[PDB]
Structure formats: structure tokens, C-alpha cells
Amino acid sequence: AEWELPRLRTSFIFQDDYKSQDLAEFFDVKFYPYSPPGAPPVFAATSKKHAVICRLTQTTDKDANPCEIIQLIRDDGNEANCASCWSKDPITDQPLLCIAGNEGNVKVYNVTEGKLYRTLVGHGGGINDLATSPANPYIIASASDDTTIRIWSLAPEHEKQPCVCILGGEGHSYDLLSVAFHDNGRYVLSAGHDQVINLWALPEFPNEHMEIPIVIYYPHFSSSEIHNNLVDCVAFYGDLILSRACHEDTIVLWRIEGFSSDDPIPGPLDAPTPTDMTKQTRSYFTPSRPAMFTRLAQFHTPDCGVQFFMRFRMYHVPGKHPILAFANAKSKTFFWDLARFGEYARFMADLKEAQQSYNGRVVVVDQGQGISLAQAQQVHGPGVGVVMKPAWLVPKGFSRETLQAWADMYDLSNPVGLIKAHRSLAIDGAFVGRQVGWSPEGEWCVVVGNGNRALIYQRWGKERGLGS
Amino acid sequence: TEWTVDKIASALSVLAEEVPQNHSRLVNFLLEETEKRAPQPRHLSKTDPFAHMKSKAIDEGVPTMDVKFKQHSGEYGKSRNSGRRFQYPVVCIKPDREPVPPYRFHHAEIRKNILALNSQLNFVPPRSQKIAKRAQAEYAATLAPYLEPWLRKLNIEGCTKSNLIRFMASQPESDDSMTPQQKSNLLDTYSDDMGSPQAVRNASMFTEAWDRVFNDQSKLRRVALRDILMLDKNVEPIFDNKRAKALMQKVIDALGSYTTLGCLICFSHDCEHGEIERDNQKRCFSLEEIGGLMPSLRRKWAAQIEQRQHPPCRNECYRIHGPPWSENEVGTLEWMFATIGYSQTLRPECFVGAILGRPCWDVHRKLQELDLRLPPVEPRTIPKQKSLPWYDRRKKQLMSDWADATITHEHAVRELFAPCHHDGPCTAANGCPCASAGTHPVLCERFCLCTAEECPLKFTGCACHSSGKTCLQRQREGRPCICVQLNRECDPTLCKGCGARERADPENAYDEVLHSTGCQNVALQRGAAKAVVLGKSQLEACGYGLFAAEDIEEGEFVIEYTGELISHDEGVRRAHRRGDVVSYLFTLLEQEGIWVDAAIYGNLSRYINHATDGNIMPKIMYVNHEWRIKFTAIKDIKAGEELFFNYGDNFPNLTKKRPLLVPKTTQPLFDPLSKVQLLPGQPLPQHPIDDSWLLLKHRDNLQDFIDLRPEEKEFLQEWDAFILRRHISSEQYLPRYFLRFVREKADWLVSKRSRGEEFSKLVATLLARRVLPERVVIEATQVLNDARGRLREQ
Ligand SMILES: [Zn+2]
Ligand SMILES: [Zn+2]
Ligand SMILES: [Zn+2]
Ligand SMILES: [Zn+2]
Ligand SMILES: [Zn+2]
Ligand SMILES: [Zn+2]
Ligand SMILES: [Zn+2]
Ligand SMILES: [Zn+2]
């Protein structure tokens, strides 16, 4: 069961709300992250004018609808929106949905009671992305056309001046498209049209009124060299970095040399400064001249074309396989199970090992049957070498084509290779993905995009054989 | 051991197989580590907050939207039918707040103009070669750590990293890639002897074999051996251009860091003065700009001998009395000796004694036993010269057709030449740039080596004095202020009668009684702006504007226009990077090509809007050898009124060529940092200027010099971090801040031998310029001996 990947289960189209009769899009989707373990998963999908809040419930009836819309909010102002994140009321613990758009304000909605909690005002241009700190649910970051990141606190002591930090200076020079928090809540990634990816270290913020935000002038790592185009999505994966740029058809996995979240957080006066204007990479963290970053792997996402503002999402929870999902600009959704890479490498090593110590006389048997590395050794005894193969390793002695298909999906030996998706699901009609979200227990994966369309994928389902 | 290119290349190909094997192991390791460190979800609520909420699907007057659902199953995603449509009621929510007016970048305040480096254009709102070189650099970094283990494994005579570097240096492509002095430094670490004939042969074959295996011109990921060798940590410094640089040659060489970097205006070693070249090499505005140590030191001597006619140190003074020396200690004794010079009242013994840890009779013992000889200094005959018909430097007056005879007052046409440092009269015959470098002569200024006695071009200040206000634009005296006439502010040293000495001192900036009389021509130095407040402009189609927060009388100084000082080409690059070709670049010196860019760094003056009938007026002023922009009220202005000036031609399109309160206004007003809306009658926000980011840049600039030793960087950065914060532009205030520095850093200075040594070189350089009075060196001896005494507590 642990190796299962999702399949399409439900899809819906939400009425066009930017009328032109279907140029509306869902730009964001986010599952609520603060519910008790096991609670029915709830996500918000954000269109230009609406926040569509849905609960997903697993069903034994294959014809039933797992998706119920429990709240539908319209931004009754002039702003058109494209970014969302979840927070909580610090007094009441009620869910708060933050929504932001082309006027440069964050609206914070009390979604259960359907009213405005507050507005966060101060950005000088449209906001393109929002993220909540994993370490403090009252702390949120916004990325703007004004080229800055603003950090906000919803904590009651900051109510009169809720901007606690501005990431400014010269690190970014054009519209920002993506902002992301490290799990420790102290490192922030930002990126956008200037093709720069910056990593910033946040100070601790006093739990009292701050008359002015703290201003940070220098990122602790900065590079325009990982991509050759505008960067529209960045994230931490542990301490590693994932990012994608326009025109490249890849998601790049890479790392900052010397960066570890186990080390002490540097203070703002440890950051590097641009003393040499020909250097397009600089780093506080750096441990023959050393590279400051290493490209590790590239996930192949074909047919993104010239489209940008397309975001991927990793599912990363203790005890479950890490899954990367992303939808392209040509009606495909892609998944990679990152645990397959290690199992493939183990298998190929066991396979090569047995080819030597048995001169080529080796037998491969599928795992996940009644058969073991024992019951299979009893059938031929010490004369043969028996190697166990993962069931999801399917062919097409293995042929070259079979080995090449496997390497295309699971071989990690080339940093500028292209890793084929482990599952690739076709979408009906013309579709461009904007955002992906995962339910807390990973059984649901929701892709949203143009035509105000939501695609809802499921695994570990409960269906039991027609019900209509 | 009979190697060929073929055999080496075949062996490299086999060793190369571990590169993708190591990479796969690394990535799988990192992935497995990251999988294990997945975070637990935090801040979970005890109950499901959505549990009570039911589907809003409709089974009056409420807005409604449609949603069509489809169900899918199988591996292909086939729909079970064509879909079921539902209707939902909509909760409409308005925001309670408007956005602030738009802007780009985080706007940060600077106390004074800062000097920008030239930037590259890497992005606009040959590509193919940027892409290829990035790919090659990544591969080169991947391969570099394999070279030495592979060479150890192959164990080929003459195939060592050092010998492959010597071979690289000897090849023809090193002419296509290196320079004279770079070869020089390579062949000092490496030499050009590559060993036996077979060694030279093997190194050649290895290089050819490497370029065959790894530098195939078919691939995007290719790297020549030369590319990896240039990464070597003993090679790359040679291709690094961040370079700062009998008896007297020793002193000159010893004080070189200070004579080269030390600013003549603000006394910092990394600062906002000087000139940035197109490759961002910097010519500092330092002693080297006016001939180095000797022409200034020679004049000090000459003037010292042309004077023809206290308590002893508390370090066992040689004036009461009278362990082997290192050459450093001797050197210290020499440069102090040479720059103290023919002094009547100050003697090296005591100060050198406090600098080293030595008693004052000791360095006299060493001094006498070494008998150092000061070069002979001729009497400097001043050949007498006619006064000029347009300028009398003794009555401090302009006469006749002065406006036609000089461009001293015409900043838009001025070009910046080094202050003159020739040996003779300031004439065209002598190549004095002040007399002759421009269309007309300009006055000699305070950094020219000539004196007011010799030179009739020498500016000597204004003569104004009054118990009332003076040095005014429209002087009641009937004798005008020459400083005002020359579009310059008064000089705290030269303008002795008007009280500029006290009024140009920022420490008196808010002494309103002082400033109510005397010099009214030091407003930029005083540094006090009228109270102003950011707001939404009254002009539709403008965003922000700036509003008076107090009454302003006609003729009063309002504010300075600060920003980044940039060249013309940098201005064009910036406009293109910003999308414009909305880019406002204030022309500071048109002919010299200096603009002020406030798009990111500046102050609130950047928000003042254009009007044809403005209420303030900009003016470019000469201020102690800086050019700066002030604004003056041309009408009475009431608190709450918006400020405007006529942009005129100040912003060229470069590509196409009594507590302080928030006032009552109709317009919303904003805190400039939090952008919080201000309420009338609240205290007006006045946030202190945050400068630590700028001090860090200047510290790091010094840290990057390849030819500065760590001991020098340490002291230079300590002095700069202190002195940059005082924003000095006049030598009138240096002795005070020098003495504060010696007191605050006394313990630090005596704790480590190199710090005292470097501090003495600073002292020596400023003595040689006669910019540091002898009395503060005397007092500094006491402070250092004091602290050294207090340190004898182990
Ligand atoms: Zn300076
Ligand atoms: Zn003495
Ligand atoms: Zn001259
Ligand atoms: Zn001169
Ligand atoms: Zn002169
Ligand atoms: Zn005067
Ligand atoms: Zn004057
Ligand atoms: Zn004056």
C-alpha cells in the first residue's frame, strides 16, 4: 500500500468569475494544516474573485461525490487575487484564510463565520505569493511586485503595527513570484522575474509592539545562476532546495554548500555583501575554489512552453513516502515518489552483485507476493542467485529498452539529466496547472488551474464497486 | 610507464566512471536523510474547526454561483457520466482598508550621498554564451576535486598539479588569457622549470589527454584542464584585481596603505568619495591623488624650519633620564621620526614609547644609537605674483567681471581634476589644472598644495561678521558674502568671522539660539531639516508627495536631496533594468557626469512632486569639496501644505539623449517605514537613520583587498567603523573625533602590538599632512600610557 500513487477521482468547474466567458483561473489551493489528526481534510481554492472552501470525505460509492463545498467567499472589492495561506485567530483558534492580489493588500478572512478578520496594508504593488511560517502560525510572508518581502504577525501584541520585517536592499530588482519558509521558520526563500533566488535569515521578533519593522538589507545566500530564466516557484525540501524557471521544463533539486539547519542561525551582519559586481552567486555558508551550490537532480516536466506562475508541491510527512506533484501547461499531472530512487538503486546493486558471484546465473522474483528471499532460495538452492525486484519495476535478463526506461525514471547519477515522471496522468481538455496541494494524510492531491478547474486525485480509497 | 596520449586518455575515461557513481550515492544519501527528517505537523487544534459546517449546495436575493462536478474512476480517469451541476450562495466580504500609494523597492534613508558601483545588466523586463559558460563552470566544479586523487592514482612522472600549471602557463593560449604581471606572479610561485624531458613530455600528454576526454567541443558540459587549474587557490589570486596598491623610501613604503586609501575629506579608508572606474576599480580621494607622502611632507619640513626662535611623558621620560628591537619597532621609530620632523614641541621618543611597550629613555637610546638623517630641505622661495583683477584673496572679495573670468561658481560645467600639487606658481606655464585645465581658471582649494601667501587663486573664505544673521543670499551689509556668490557653503576653518566654525558642527545642529544669528550658509553641514511628513499627493496621477509638518519661512533651508551617486552609463543601465525605456535621476554635475539616484536610497525629498509654481527651489552647492543638493523655500509654507518644486531640466531622460506633530491635512499621511497611517496631533515620527548595513559594506570592501595584511585590515576597519559614523567633511572637527577614538579604543589599542603599530601609521600620515595638531599626539601618548598601565593587571 505504501507504494501507491494517486489517480483522478473527482473534478469540478467553478463558474467563470472574471467575465469573456472562460479566462478565469484558480491560482492557488491550500489544505488547512491545523486540524486534529484524522479530521476530514479541508482545502481552499482561490480564484481571481472567490475562495472556494471544500471538505473531502472518502466514500465506498464510486459514483458518490467526495467533495462538498462548505464555504464560498467573494472578494467584494476591486482586487483580483492569486495567492492564499492559512493562519489562526490567536484568541479563538478559528481558521483564518489570507488572500492577496493585484492591489497589494492581504485580506484575512474568518472563514467559518464568513467575515473579514482584518487587512494587512503596506505593500507597494500586487502580491503574487503568501506563505505561513511552519514554526509560528501567526507569522506570514508576502511576495510583491514592489520587489520586497514583508513579514507579518497576527499576534495580539502586534495588532497596531503588524509588519515585523521587510526583506529589502538590493537583493531583488524586479517583481517577486515565490516565497517559502524553512521548517524552522527562520530561513526564507524568495524568487521572481529577476532570476535571483535569495535565502534570508530572519531575526527573532519581540513579543511586543514594534513601531517599525526590522529591515533586512542582505540575503545570506543569493544566486541568479541555478536557472537561466525567471524563477516562479521555490521551496525547501528539508535543507535541500527545489525550484523551477520558465522555459526549462524541469524542477531542479539542488543544495547550498555548507547550509545546515542544525547550525546556529546567522545574524544579519554575517551576510555577504556585493563587493564584486561580476559575481552572480554569493554565500555566507560556503565551507581549489569551492562551488557555492550543487545541482543534484532535475525532474522532467515537459510541455510547460512559455507559461510561468506554475507551482509544484511536495508531500513530506513522517513515516510516508515523499511525493512530488506538478501539472504542466498541456493537460498532464506528474508524480514522483522519492522513495523509489533508493529502492531502485538497492535493486540494481543487488542485481549487479549477484551477476558477479553467480557468473550470470541469477533469478529475479517480484516482491509483494507470498514469496521471500528464502522461499525463493529453497526452489533452486545455493546454485542460483535470487534477487528481489520491486513490483512497480515493470518491463516493456532484461532488455536494453527495459533498463533504459527504468534509468530514465530512477537513475540519479546525472545532475543535468532529466528524470521522467513516475506517473503521468492525462487531463481532459486543455488545462494549465497553477498550484498543487496535498491533504495531511496524503490520500488526496488537488491540482487547480485555468478554466476555474480543480482536479482531485486520490489514493488509498475506499470504493467498493458501483453505486448508481 | 611508457605513456601516450591514448593511454592516459583511456585511463582517465575509466577513472571518470566514479563521477556519476559518486553523484548517485550523494543524491540518494541526501534524499534518505531528508526523508528521515520530515517534520511533525505543529500547532494542531484539539477539535476540527470545520466539523459543524455543512454543504452549502442549494436544495432569495442572495448572489449565487454554479459548480459542475464529475466523478472519475479506473487508471485512465474516465468519467462516470457527463457531470452534475449545483448552485451555491455567496458570502460577499469587502475589505476595510485601501492600499497605500504604489512604489517599487524598499526605500531606505541615508544621511549623506553614497557612491554606487557599476552594475551589470543580467536581466531586462550574448545569451547563448552565458548559458554555455554556466554549464561549463558547474562541470569544472564537479571535476576539480577529482584531479589530485586521479593524479596520485596514475602516478605519472611530471603529472602533478603544480607541473600542469607550469605547462598551462607556457602554452600559447596563455597569451589569449593572461597579462604580463600575471605571468610574472605565476612564475614566482611556480617557475618555468618543469623537470626532466620526460616530465615535460608527460605533462603535455596529460593536458592533451584531459582535453580530449573532458573538453570535447560536441558537448555542452565540457571543461578544459586549464579551466580547472584556474580554480586553484594559488592561481586565482593572481587573476584577482582587488588591489589597494634610503630612509624615506622605507617610510613611504610603510605608510602606503594610509596614503593610498585615506580620504582627504572624511578620513575613512573606505568611503563615499573618490572615483569609480568602469570596471569598478576605485581611485580614492587620498594623498596619492596629490603626489603621495613626499610633496606634503617636504612642505611640512620647509615650514617647520621656517620657524626660527610640555610636561615630560609618564613612561620614564628621556627628558628626565636618557631588550632587542625588532625591525618593526625600528620601522615604527623611523616613520614617526620622519613625520614628526623638525618639530619644536613634539618628539618621537614619548609617542613611540607609548606605541611600543617601551620606556621613553629606551627609544631615545635606540634613537641616538641609530642617528637617522632627514633629507635636506631647501628654502622654498615664493616668486611674487600679480593679484587677479577679479578676486582679491585678502579682502575676500570678487570684483570686476568675475562671473565671466572663472567657472568656480558654475558647477554644471566643472570637471573634477586632482587638487594641484606642482612645485611652482599656479599658472598655465606650470600645468596647474586649476589655472588651465578648464575653459576658465578655477580657484585653488584647501587640498591644493599652494598656500594663500603664494597663490592668488587660493580661496581664503568669506569676511562676513555680524552680531545678527550674515552670509545671506541678499546681504544687507552692502558687501556680499563671497561664499554665497560662489554657490558654496562656508568653510568651518576658513570662514572665521561668521561663526561657521560652530554652526557647521552637527553637534550644534539644534542650538536654535546659535543659529538665529551669524552664518546662515552652512545648512547642509548643519544637517537639520525642516519637519516633513510623507503622504498621498494632492495631484491626481501622482502617488506619494511630501508635506510640511511645521511652518517654513521664505528663504529657509528645507531638506537635502540625497541618493546614490552614479555615472551616465549606470543611469542608462538602471533605467533599462527598471523597464522605463518613471526613472528620476537628479543631475549633480552635468559636465562631469554625476547623477543622484534616490530610487532605493535617499531621504523623504525623493517624494517631492513637480509643479510649475513650486514653493521650494533646488540648488547645487559646493560643500567642503563635495557637491550637494539643497532645497530652499521660495514662499512661506504652512504646516500641512504639500511641497513642490519645478523639475526644470534637473532630471534628464538619459536614453533619449513646540513639539513636532502630525499636521491636519485632507490627504492621508504615512509612517515612511511601517506605512501605518498617521493621525493629526500625534507625535511626528522621526526614526533614527539605520546605518549598520552601510558600515558592513565598507568593512567588507576593505576585507576584500588581496594586498592588505590581516593586521592592517583589522585596524583600518576599526577606525573606519568609528569615523564613518561622524560624516566628517571638514578637518576642523577631526582632532575632536581623533581624541574620542583614542580614548574609546585605548584598551583595544594597547592589547595587541599590531594595533598600536597601525594606529601610529595613521597618526604619522595625518601629521605629515599637518591635519592633526601636535597637541592631540601629546595627549594621545598619555591615554595610551594610561591604558598600558591599567593593563599591567595581567
Ligand atoms: Zn571620504
Ligand atoms: Zn617621554
Ligand atoms: Zn596650482
Ligand atoms: Zn590649485
Ligand atoms: Zn594655487
Ligand atoms: Zn560670508
Ligand atoms: Zn564663508
Ligand atoms: Zn558664513
**DSSP string covering B114-138, please?**
EEPPP--------HHHHHHHHHHHH
Residue B579 to residue B600: CA distance in whole angstroms: 15
**Phi and psi at residue A237, in whole multiples of 5°?**
-125, 95
Nearest CA in chain A to B103: A124
Tell me the CB-side half-sphere exposure of residue B472, using CA atoms within 13 A: 18
In a domain, residue A124? The reply is: yes
Count of CB atoms situated within 10 Å of the CB of A67: 22
Count of CB atoms situated within 10 Å of the CB of B5: 16
Identify whether residues A358 and A400 lie together within a single domain: yes
In the DSSP assignment, the letter for residue B518 is: E
- How many domains is chain B built from? 2
Identify whether residues A116 and A39 lie together within a single domain: yes
In a domain, residue A468? The reply is: no
In a domain, residue B200? The reply is: yes
First and final CA of chain B: distance in angstroms?
Answer: 64
In a domain, residue B665? The reply is: yes
CATH number at residue A237: 2.130.10.10
By the CB < 8 Å criterion, does B97 face chain A? yes
**Phi and psi at residue A179, in whole multiples of 5°?**
-140, 140
In a domain, residue A337? The reply is: no
* Least CB–CB distance from B88: residue in A72, A239, A411: A72
Resolution for this experimental structure (Å): 2.1
Identify whether residues A235 and A347 lie together within a single domain: no
Identify whether residues A280 and A320 lie together within a single domain: yes
* Least CB–CB distance from B92: residue in A76, A166, A468: A76
Q: After which residues does a break in chain A occur, C–N more than 2.5 Å?
A: 19, 287, 396
Give B 45-84 residues with CB within 8 A of chain A. 45-57, 63, 65-77, 79-80, 84
By the CB < 8 Å criterion, does A205 face chain B? no
Residue A398 structural domain? 342-410
Give B 593-612 residues with CB within 8 A of chain A. 600
Identify whether residues A260 and A401 lie together within a single domain: no
Q: What are the contacts of A258-267 at 24+ separation with CB within 8 A? A: A258/A283, A258/A285, A258/A286, A258/A287, A259/A199, A259/A221, A259/A285, A261/A182, A261/A183, A261/A184, A261/A187, A265/A186, A265/A187, A265/A201, A266/A201, A266/A220, A267/A201, A267/A203
Binding site members of B for S-adenosyl-L-methionine:
544, 583-584, 609-610, 655
Q: Which of B212, B239, B266 is the last residue of a domain?
A: B239
Residue A354 to residue A343: CA distance in whole angstroms: 16
Instruction: State the distance from the centre of ligand 4 to the C-alpha of B496, rounded, in angstroms.
Output: 22
In the DSSP assignment, the letter for residue B11 is: H
CATH number at residue B554: 2.170.270.10
Which residues have a Cβ under 8 Å from the Cβ of B578 and sit 6 or more positions away?
A173, B104, B125, B599
In a domain, residue B431? The reply is: no
Q: How was this structure determined?
A: X-ray
Identify whether residues A171 and A212 lie together within a single domain: yes
Give B 144-163 residues with CB within 8 A of chain A. 144-145
Identify whether residues A308 and A195 lie together within a single domain: yes
Q: Would the CB atoms of B50 and A77 count as touching at under 8 Å?
A: no
Q: Would the CB atoms of B73 and A463 count as touching at under 8 Å?
A: yes
Q: Is A399 exposed, middle or buried (0-12, 13-18, 19+ CB in 10 A)?
A: exposed
Q: Which of B641, B662, B678 is the last residue of a domain?
A: B678
Q: Are strands A221-223 and A127-132 parallel, antiparallel or unpaired?
A: unpaired
* Least CB–CB distance from A74: residue in B46, B77, B92: B92
Q: Would the CB atoms of B43 and A55 count as touching at under 8 Å?
A: no
Most A CBs within 10 Å, among B25, B35, B142, to test the A interface: B35
Identify whether residues A393 and A246 lie together within a single domain: no
Q: Indicate which ligand has the atom closest to the C-alpha of B475.
A: 6
Owner of C-alpha cell 576599480: B281
Binding site members of B:
263, 266, 271, 273, 313, 317, 350, 360, 420, 422, 426, 432, 434, 444, 448, 450, 455, 462, 464, 471, 481, 483, 490, 495, 498, 519, 544, 583-584, 609-610, 655-656
Instruction: State the distance from the centre of ligand 6 to the C-alpha of B463, rounded, in angstroms.
Output: 6
Identify whether residues A268 and A355 lie together within a single domain: no
A37 contact residues in B (CB cutoff 8 A): 41, 44
In a domain, residue A65? The reply is: yes
Residue B163 structural domain? 5-18+136-239
Tell me if A347 sits within 8 A of A339, measured CB to CB.
no
Q: Would the CB atoms of B66 and A289 count as touching at under 8 Å?
A: no
Computed from CA positions of residues B727, B601, A151, A164, in that sequence, does the dihedral angle turn out positive or negative?
A: positive
In a domain, residue A256? The reply is: yes
Secondary element (H or E) of residue B213: helix B197-214
Identify whether residues A234 and A382 lie together within a single domain: no
Q: What are the contacts of B32-38 at 24+ separation with CB within 8 A? A: B32/A342, B33/A238, B34/A237, B34/A238, B34/A239, B34/A240, B34/A322, B35/A321, B35/A322, B35/A338, B35/A339, B37/A238, B38/A238, B38/A316, B38/A317, B38/A318, B38/A319, B38/A320, B38/A322
**Beta bridge partners of residue A252, listed in sequence order:** A243, A298
Q: Which of A271, A309, A160, A56 is nearest to B679 (CA)?
A: A160
**Phi and psi at residue B481, in whole multiples of 5°?**
-80, 120
By the CB < 8 Å criterion, does B582 face chain A? no
Given phi > 0 = left and psi -120 to 50 = alpha, else beta, which region is A318?
A: beta
* Least CB–CB distance from A124: residue in B23, B100, B233: B100
- How many domains is chain A built from? 2
3-state secondary structure chain A: CCCCCCEEEEEEEECCCCCCCCCCEEEEEEECCCCCCCCCCEEEEEECCEEEEEEECCCCCCCCCCEEEEEEEEECCCCCEEEEEEEECCCCCCEEEEEEECCCCEEEEECCCCEEEEEECCCCCCEEEEEECCCCCCEEEEEECCCCEEEEECCHHHCCCCEEEEECCCCCCCCEEEEEECCCCCEEEEEECCCCEEEEECCCCCCCCCCCCEEECCCCEEECCCCCCCEEEEEEECCEEEEEECCCCEEEEEEECCCCCCCCCCCHHHCCCCCCCCCCEEECCCCCCCCCEEEEEEEECCCCCCCCCCCCEEECCCCCCCEEEEECCCCEEEEEECHHHHHHHHHHHHHHHHHHCCCCCEEEEECCCCCCCCCCHHHHHHHCEEEEECCCCCCCCCCHHHHHHHHHHHCCCCCCCCECCCEEEECCCCCCEEEEEECCCCCEEEEEEECCEEEEEECCCCCCCCCC
A289-315 residues labelled b (16+ CB within 10 A) or e (exposed): eebbbbbbbbbbbbebeebbbbbbbbb
Q: Would the CB atoms of B34 and A289 count as touching at under 8 Å?
A: no
> Grid coordinates representing A109?
478572512
Owner of C-alpha cell 587638487: B419
Q: Which of A100, A212, A130, A122 is nearest to A164 (CA)?
A: A212
Tell me the CB-side half-sphere exposure of residue A426, using CA atoms within 13 A: 7
Instruction: State the distance from the centre of ligand 7 to the C-alpha of B483, rounded, in angstroms.
Output: 5
In a domain, residue A119? The reply is: yes
Identify whether residues A263 and A213 lie together within a single domain: yes
| Sheet strands (E) in B189-287 | 275-276, 282-283
In a domain, residue A463? The reply is: no
Q: Which of B239, B264, B283 is the last residue of a domain?
A: B239
Rg (CA), chain B: 35
The amino acid at residue A97 is L
| Sheet strands (E) in B456-521 | 469-470, 518-519
Q: Which of B692, B706, B632 is nearest to A270 (CA)?
A: B692
Q: Is B443 exposed, middle or buried (0-12, 13-18, 19+ CB in 10 A)?
A: buried
> Grid coordinates representing B693?
548595513
Q: Is B659 exposed, middle or buried (0-12, 13-18, 19+ CB in 10 A)?
A: exposed
Identify whether residues A440 and A365 lie together within a single domain: no
Helices (H), B230-292: 247-254, 256-261
> Grid coordinates representing A181?
519558509
Residue B136 to residue B222: CA distance in whole angstroms: 6
